[PDB]
Design a protein around this ligand. Structure first.
Ligand SMILES: OC1(c2ccc(Cl)c(C(F)(F)F)c2)CCN(CCCC(c2ccc(F)cc2)c2ccc(F)cc2)CC1
Ligand SMILES: OC1(c2ccc(Cl)c(C(F)(F)F)c2)CCN(CCCC(c2ccc(F)cc2)c2ccc(F)cc2)CC1
Ligand SMILES: CCCCCCCCCCC(=O)O
Ligand SMILES: CCCCCCCCCCC(=O)O
Ligand SMILES: CCCCCCCC(=O)O
Ligand SMILES: CCCCCCCC(=O)O
Ligand SMILES: CCCCCCCC(=O)O
Ligand SMILES: CCCCCCC(=O)O
Ligand SMILES: CCCCCC(=O)O
Ligand SMILES: CCCCCC(=O)O
Ligand SMILES: [Ca+2]
Ligand SMILES: [Ca+2]
Ligand SMILES: [Cl-]
Ligand SMILES: [Cl-]
Ligand SMILES: [Cl-]
Ligand SMILES: [Cl-]
Ligand SMILES: [Zn+2]
Ligand SMILES: [Zn+2]
Lengths: 382, 382
């Protein structure tokens, strides 16, 4: 019935809120008003979905959530993970977009920004499991999530990433992951865990959910004891250069998966060889673009607002091949890096820059239809 | 003590809120963060002031308020005016920036946008009075505001306008002054008349101030009978082509006043000869710029976001002379039209476009120093 035999799952990045988990007035993550990715692709008869996973959590936490988003069930972050980092083992429970998901029934994964990292880690778990969980269930017994077992292959057809910081970003290193702004992010999460809140910012496993009969002062006190304040099991850490490198060092190429990347630049070279944001860079990335663009290492300067070009092309120590925009992108086992999109900033990929008239809806529709056609190709060359 | 002999009064336009009358978080009208016109000019030893007058009111109402802002005392809109339009005769009372203002003690007036119209009308009243008020106090006796008497000359040295819609704007005609959006404006003013409100949006003379012991429902009921809902004694009407024409038809050149105008362009000609806003046009003017730029009459298309160039150069029926940037702007009695600032939109003149990095503080400082210099010149060529 659907033109695509494998469902496509779109996976948002850091700070991403989608569907019913957004504020009353909020941009629509996948396409803004420029091209309503989910609705429009569906009207054209494609089977597509937008995952909802932790906005502020680690790639680990998100990757677990992604699995349960697709498969359905109670999120299980793993007993060893929970014990090591100091957060609940069990999380939200998901209906499941594909309850029969198993070897043989594949899914296409496309990720924006951090979503690309999240996708890689989930596949890692499927294929290779999680060593610390395997080891913990070996020593202490009990039940272990199948997600952490390994040996589950032939479940993801493609991994396609848009402006993903495969190699991290200095914006995290020098801003996002600093003490003062982590405190802000966590305070936000605390607040939005209050008992009148309808949005889940993705750190409730750390205890940021006020109980219905608990005072806010008692909430604050309970939650000041959480390890979140000092942990590295969070998005801000994972987007640093170190944090991303760690994911790179523990991931590996699946020879059956079609891997493809897209990258945007929205900076321009200035007097001294530093990079500054283009007029038309969504203004919220003004400061981060300048931090990146003024890097000591020259090859780390060009950026889409928050992720350097080097970081988005491909994970740095994984195999890649520079590809053309016209040629079929059909190679398995290798990062097919599409040609840099000139003038696209980080958020132009998802169409929410309503300030930028150069980036039009028809363009964005072509981009997404572009990706679907590549995915159709992958299906046809099996 | 002050380098300028005559105080300079800056007069904000439509929707302008200044000083103690702005919300908690709000751009500073005169210079934004780019150049703090009042503070900086003062530091350089100039005597300058920012008037506070009705943000939503007619040019008439604002013009009266301007007078009392400068002179001090209880705003008197005039008995005939009040009776004809159906609003209170008396308004707020002002401390007075210049209590001794009289023929011989002059003041420089610079107006942004509608502020330019307001300034013209005030001077008209000083010089020629108000015929309706003269006639009404003739017939019915009582006291009459000196503002409406006429014969007060030699009180304003200069009238300088920035992006003033002397000939009105289609944005008013086809948006601002339509039924539905006038209702929205008036509802806003109603709401901000509530008993907890600390901002005056300028229509309280129409009854939009909830009494301390009145219910909101009774407030709504009382105020639904106001003529404001159907009146032309409001800003939206006055910024229309007709509305501005009427001011033009009742104003005339004072041969002792130095008149000077500035105009911005922030549109570009498209495929078919229509004008579209430049990237860099403050986004809130996106829709108005397109309305203006798609006008049938070609010469009405080029615009700064909300004011067409034809409208800002000079009142259409008054004398003008195209001037150069270097030409001392020292002629009395004629509209000295300064050369168009390319890429300045309506709000770049006041520096509140924080999105536009092309328009820097040092540029805006030069523009304002420029104006002061011209004013110093006027003083010295007496
Ligand atoms: O700062 C960001 C970032 C990204 C990656 C890294 Cl690595 C880092 C970090 F930490 F390293 F610095 C930071 C996160 C989000 N930023 C602003 C959010 C945009 C927002 C939006 C977009 C899509 C939506 F569905 C909803 C809202 C929005 C707001 C208002 C609006 F008028 C339009 C759009 C942009 C980038
Ligand atoms: O709509 C405007 C208009 C002007 C003339 C005519 Cl003729 C017409 C009409 F009739 F056609 F409708 C309309 C009035 C104000 N508009 C937007 C408000 C700007 C705002 C601002 C400006 C100055 C301040 F001191 C403080 C805030 C602001 C908001 C948020 C922000 F991040 C920065 C600035 C722009 C033009
Ligand atoms: C007549 C009482 C209701 C007014 C409508 C809403 C005003 C908000 C209350 C302001 C405040 O308590 O700070
Ligand atoms: C503040 C007076 C002019 C605003 C009219 C345009 C605002 C509605 C369009 C939506 C948006 O601002 O992104
Ligand atoms: C991040 C902004 C959240 C939207 C706040 C306004 C909601 C409303 O007035 O209904
Ligand atoms: C269309 C009316 C303006 C308010 C909604 C836009 C704010 C947002 O981008 O979330
Ligand atoms: C709406 C209130 C948000 C709380 C801000 C606290 C920030 C901090 O403690 O660093
Ligand atoms: C019009 C915008 C003003 C919002 C101010 C809210 C606040 O004080 O936090
Ligand atoms: C630019 C919009 C004006 C809102 C001012 C107020 O709500 O008091
Ligand atoms: C937070 C970004 C600006 C809000 C968009 C608007 O005022 O229409
Ligand atoms: Ca952009
Ligand atoms: Ca501008
Ligand atoms: Cl939020
Ligand atoms: Cl499974
Ligand atoms: Cl929640
Ligand atoms: Cl009030
Ligand atoms: Zn975790
Ligand atoms: Zn009036």
């Amino acid at each position: 019935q659907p033109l695509n035999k494998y469902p496509v799952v779109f996976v948002h990045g850091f700070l991403g809120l989608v569907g019913d988990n957004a504020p009353a007035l909020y941009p629509n993550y996948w396409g803004g008003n420029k091209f309503k990715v989910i609705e429009e692709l569906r009207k054209q008869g494609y089977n597509v979905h937008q995952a909802s996973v932790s906005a502020f959590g680690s790639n680990y936490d998100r990757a677990v959530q992604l699995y349960y988003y697709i498969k359905g069930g109670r999120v299980d972050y793993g007993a060893a993970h929970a014990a090591k980092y100091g957060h609940e083992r069990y999380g939200k429970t998901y209906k499941g977009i594909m309850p029969n998901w198993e070897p043989g029934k594949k899914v296409h994964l496309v990720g924006h920004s951090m979503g690309g990292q999240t996708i890689r880690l989930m596949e890692e778990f499927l294929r290779n499991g999680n060593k610390e969980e395997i080891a913990y269930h070996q020593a202490h017994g009990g039940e272990i999530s199948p997600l952490f077992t390994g040996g589950h292959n032939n479940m993801v057809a493609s991994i396609t990433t848009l402006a993903t910081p495969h190699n991290g970003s200095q914006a995290a290193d020098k801003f996002g992951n600093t003490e003062a702004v982590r405190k802000i992010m966590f305070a936000l999460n605390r607040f939005m865990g209050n008992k009148y809140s309808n949005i889940d910012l993705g750190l409730t496993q750390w205890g940021f959910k006020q109980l219905p009969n608990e005072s806010y002062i008692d909430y604050i006190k309970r939650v000041s004891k959480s390890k979140i304040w000092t942990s590295d099991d969070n998005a801000a850490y994972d987007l640093t250069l170190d944090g991303s490198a760690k994911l790179n060092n523990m991931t590996s190429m699946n020879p059956n998966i079609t891997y493809t990347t897209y990258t945007g630049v929205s900076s321009h070279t200035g007097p001294l060889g530093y990079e500054n944001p283009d007029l038309g860079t969504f203004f919220l990335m003004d400061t981060t673009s300048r931090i990146i663009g003024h890097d000591a290492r020259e090859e780390w300067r060009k950026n889409d607002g928050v992720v350097p070009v080097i970081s988005s092309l491909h994970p740095s120590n994984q195999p890649f091949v520079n590809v053309t925009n016209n040629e079929p992108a059909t190679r398995r086992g290798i990062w097919q890096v599409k040609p840099i999109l000139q003038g696209w900033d980080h958020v132009d990929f998802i169409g929410v820059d309503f300030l930028d008239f150069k980036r039009k809806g028809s363009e964005l529709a072509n981009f997404y239809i572009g990706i679907i056609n590549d995915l159709l190709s992958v299906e046809a060359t099996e």
